[PDB]
Amino acid sequence: KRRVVVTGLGMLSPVGNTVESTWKALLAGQSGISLIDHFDTSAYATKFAGLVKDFNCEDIISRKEQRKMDAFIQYGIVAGVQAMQDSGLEITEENATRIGAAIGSGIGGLGLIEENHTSLMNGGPRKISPFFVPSTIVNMVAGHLTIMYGLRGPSISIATAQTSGVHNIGHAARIIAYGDADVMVAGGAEKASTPLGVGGFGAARALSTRNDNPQAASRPWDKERDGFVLGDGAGMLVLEEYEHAKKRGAKIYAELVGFGMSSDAYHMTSPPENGAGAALAMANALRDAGIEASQIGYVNAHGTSTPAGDKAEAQAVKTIFGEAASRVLVSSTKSMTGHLLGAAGAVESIYSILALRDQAVPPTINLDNPDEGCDLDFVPHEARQVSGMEYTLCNSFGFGGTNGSLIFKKI
Amino acid sequence: KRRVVVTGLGMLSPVGNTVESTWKALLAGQSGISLIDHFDTSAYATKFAGLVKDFNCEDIISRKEQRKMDAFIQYGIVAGVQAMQDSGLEITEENATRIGAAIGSGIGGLGLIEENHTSLMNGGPRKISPFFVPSTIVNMVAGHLTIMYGLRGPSISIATAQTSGVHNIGHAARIIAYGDADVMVAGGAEKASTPLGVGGFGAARALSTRNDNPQAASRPWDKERDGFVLGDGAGMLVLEEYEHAKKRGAKIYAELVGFGMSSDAYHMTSPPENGAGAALAMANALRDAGIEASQIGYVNAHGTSTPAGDKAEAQAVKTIFGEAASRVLVSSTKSMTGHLLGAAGAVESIYSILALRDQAVPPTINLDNPDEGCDLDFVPHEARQVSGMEYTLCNSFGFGGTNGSLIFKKI
Numbered sequence A, B: 001k002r003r004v005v006v007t008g009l010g011m012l013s014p015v016g017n018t019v020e021s022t023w024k025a026l027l028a029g030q031s032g033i034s035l036i037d038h039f040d041t042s043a044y045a046t047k048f049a050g051l052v053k054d055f056n057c058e059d060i061i062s063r064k065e066q067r068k069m070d071a072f073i074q075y076g077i078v079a080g081v082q083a084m085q086d087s088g089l090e091i092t093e094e095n096a097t098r099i100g101a102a103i104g105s106g107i108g109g110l111g112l113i114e115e116n117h118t119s120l121m122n123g124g125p126r127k128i129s130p131f132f133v134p135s136t137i138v139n140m141v142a143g144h145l146t147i148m149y150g151l152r153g154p155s156i157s158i159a160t161a162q163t164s165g166v167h168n169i170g171h172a173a174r175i176i177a178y179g180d181a182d183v184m185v186a187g188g189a190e191k192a193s194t195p196l197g198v199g200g201f202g203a204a205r206a207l208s209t210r211n212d213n214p215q216a217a218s219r220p221w222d223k224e225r226d227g228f229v230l231g232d233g234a235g236m237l238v239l240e241e242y243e244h245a246k247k248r249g250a251k252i253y254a255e256l257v258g259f260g261m262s263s264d265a266y267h268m269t270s271p272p273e274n275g276a277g278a279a280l281a282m283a284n285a286l287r288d289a290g291i292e293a294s295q296i297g298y299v300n301a302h303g304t305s306t307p308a309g310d311k312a313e314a315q316a317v318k319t320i321f322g323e324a325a326s327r328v329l330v331s332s333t334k335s336m337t338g339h340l341l342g343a344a345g346a347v348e349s350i351y352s353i354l355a356l357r358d359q360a361v362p363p364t365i366n367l368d369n370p371d372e373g374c375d376l377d378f379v380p381h382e383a384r385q386v387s388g389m390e391y392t393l394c395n396s397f398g399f400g401g402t403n404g405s406l407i408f409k410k411i
C-alpha cells in the first residue's frame, strides 16, 4: 500500500509569481483581474482577464529556446522548475527511471497557433514555423521538463479542459501508488487570454462582460453573476511516495488521500441543475480516501461565476454534505484569480494544501448578494480562521461533463 | 486482482471504415495513401496523405449536431459507437456509474481552428463560432460519447501527441483494474490532414515528400525513407473487467496484460540513436505483464518511416529481445496506413489484438532495401502465418520523448 504526499510546489498566477506570494494575496482578498492590453479589445465584448504580471524566464529558458514555445509552455516550465527546486529532490542515474510527470492544459498554445495561422494566410505554408507542432501541443510542458531534469519515468498529459489540473494530479498519484514511479511533477498550464480564447468563450456567451469594473466581475454564487473570468497561470506539485520522501528528509506539505472522477452525461457546455455529476466525483473521492463528508473542513469549489454552474455545484454540495452542509466552508478563489482552465485544478490544489498547513481558508470575494435558498457557508468577503481542519477537498469540472475531485489530508 | 479484456472494437482508417474491412486490407498489403484534394496543395511540399474515404455519420450524428464538431470528433464518435455496439453492453441505471471513457487525440480540431481563425481575421471576433471551444478541444470525443450513451463513470482524455492511443488504452485499463470503473471505451481520434497539419509537420521537415508515388512513401526501415506519412482515422476498444465480461456472456477478443511508460529526456522532436526510451517502455510492459521478451510473438512497431526514429526502435528491439531478436516478428502497419498520430496507438492496438485471434501478422510494405546491420524480421512485403502466438506488444512514441507500450495476451 503506497501513500502519496506533496513535497514541492510551484506556481504562476494573476496574483503572484510564486507559491507564497500567491497565497498571501488570496488570504488578503486581492483580485488579479485587469484590462487586456496586449491585443486590441475594441470589438471584444470582454476586455479584461487575470494576467500573469511581469513574467520572466530569462534565467530558466534561453530566448533561443523561448522561440520554440508558447506562453503556456514557458509558464508551465517555470512553475515546474520552482516545484522541482522547492522539493530538494536530486535526480541521479538510480532515480531518473522512477521520476516522471503528468502535466496538461485545457486549450494549449493558442497564441502561437494564431501566429502560425496568420503567417500561412499572409504568405503560404512557407511561413509556418518548423516549431508549429512542438511549440503548441499540450504535452510540451512535460516534454521540456523531463528533458531539463533527465526524468525518464512515466510522462503523460491529460487534456480534460477545465478539469485537467485535478486529473493530472489524480493520475500522477495513481501512477505513483501503482508502482510505476516514485515521484511525479504534476499539474497544468494555460495562457488563453488571446483573440481566440476571449473571442471563443465570448462567442459561447460564457464570459463576464463587466468591463466597467473588471475586479468585481468574478462573483461566484452572487445574484449578479454574468459568466466566468479568464485567468492565465500554471500550478505544479511534486508528488512522492511516503517512504521515498521520508528516507530523503523531504519537507511534506500534505498527503493526497482521495481522487474521484465522474461524467455528467448531460450537455456539452453545461451541467445538470441537480449537479449529479459533481456529486458523484466528490462521492468517489471520499470513498477513495475512506472518510465521510463530515470530515472535510473546506471545499475549494470549481465556482466559476456562471449562472448555471454555480447553482449546480451548490446543489451537489448540499447533496454530499447534507447535515454538515452548513458546517463545511466552501469558497471559490476564482473570485480573485479568474478561471485558469487546465491550470485551475492545479493552482487550486495548492490552495487546498496551504489551507491545511496554515489552518486558514481564503474568501469568495464579491459575494454581495448570494443566491436565495442556499444554506451554505461560501466564506464571503474575508479569509476565515479554522481550528482542527485535517482534510480539504478540491473540485474541478469541464466541458464534456468531465468531473474530478481531490482530497488532501493534513500530514 | 482485476484483469482487463477487450470486448468491443470500432475503427475508421485509410484502408477501411470498419474493423474487419481494415484488417482484411492490411493482411492484403494494401495502401490507403492518396493525393490530397480538399485543399490546394500547390505550395505544399507534401501533397498526399492517408485519408478516410467516404466518411458517413448521417445515421449516427445529425447535421444539426455535426455543425458543432471537427472531423476528428465525428470520426471518434462513429468509431466509438461501432465499438459500443460490437460489445453488446447494455447501459442501465445500475451500470451508468461504472462505465466511462479515456479518449484522446494528438492535435485535435485543426480544421475548425483554421475556420474560426480565418473568420476572425476576415470579420472580427463577431465571426468566431459559439462552438469554437467545444468543437475543437481534445476531450470532446469522450464528451459526446458519454452523453450519447448515458455513461457516468470516469472520463479522461490523454493528449500525448503520437503516443495518445496507447496511453488512453493503458490508463483506461488502469482505471478498470484500480476499481474506479468496470468498463471503458478507450482509444483516440485524429484528422490532421489540413494546411496547418501538413504545413506544420512539413515545416519541421518530418514528412515524406515522395509525391511521384504516394503509395510507396511510407517505407519503415527502408534505406530510401524520407519522413513519415500523415493518416486520419479513429480506433476504439471497449475494455472490461474479466468477471463483468463473462457474467454477461461477452465476446472476448483478447486480454490487456501489460502497460509501460517511459521518457526519453533527450530531444523535443527526436529520440536518441540508442532508443533507450523505447527500450524502457517495452521493458516496463513486460515486467507489468510478468512475462519475458521471448514470449512476444509479434511487435506492432511505431515505425514511422523517418530516418532517425526507425533506427532507434530497431536498436531498442535488439536490446529488449537480444537472443530472440531474430525470432520475434516486427512490422509497421504505418507502411500502409500512414501515421494517425493520436489514433495510431489505438488502431495499432486493434491490429495487435487481431493478429492474436487470427494467428496472422501484417506486413511492412515497401521494404525494398532494409538498413544495413539489422538482424530483425520486419515482415517485409507479405503477411505472415504464425503458430503458437500467445502475446503481442504494441509501441507508440511521441514528441517530448513520451513513450508507451501495451502487451496483449490470447484469451
Ligand SMILES: C[C@]12C[C@@]34CCC(=O)[C@@](C)(CCC(=O)Nc5c(O)ccc(C(=O)O)c5O)[C@@H]3[C@H](C[C@@H]1C4)O2
Residues within 6 Å of the ligand: A162, A204, A205, A206, A207, A227, A228, A268, A269, A270, A271, A304, A306, A307, A308, A309, A310, A339, A397, A398, A399, A400, A401
Ligand atoms: C449553451 C450554454 C448554456 C449557458 C447557460 C448560462 C451559463 O451559465 C453558461 C454561460 C455556462 C454553463 C456552465 O457553467 N458551463 C461549464 C461547465 O459545464 C463545466 C465547466 C465550466 C467552466 O467554466 O469550468 C463551465 O462554464 C452556459 C454555456 C454557454 C451557453 C449559455 O452553455
Ligand SMILES: C[C@]12C[C@@]34CCC(=O)[C@@](C)(CCC(=O)Nc5c(O)ccc(C(=O)O)c5O)[C@@H]3[C@H](C[C@@H]1C4)O2
Residues within 6 Å of the ligand: B162, B204, B205, B206, B207, B227, B228, B268, B269, B270, B271, B304, B306, B307, B308, B309, B310, B339, B397, B398, B399, B400, B401
Ligand atoms: C529536429 C529534427 C531532427 C530530424 C532528423 C531526421 C528525422 O528522422 C526527423 C524528421 C524525425 C525524428 C523522429 O523520428 N521524431 C519522432 C519522435 O521522436 C517521436 C514520434 C515521432 C512520430 O512521428 O511519431 C517522430 O517522428 C527529425 C525531426 C525533424 C528535424 C529533422 O526533428
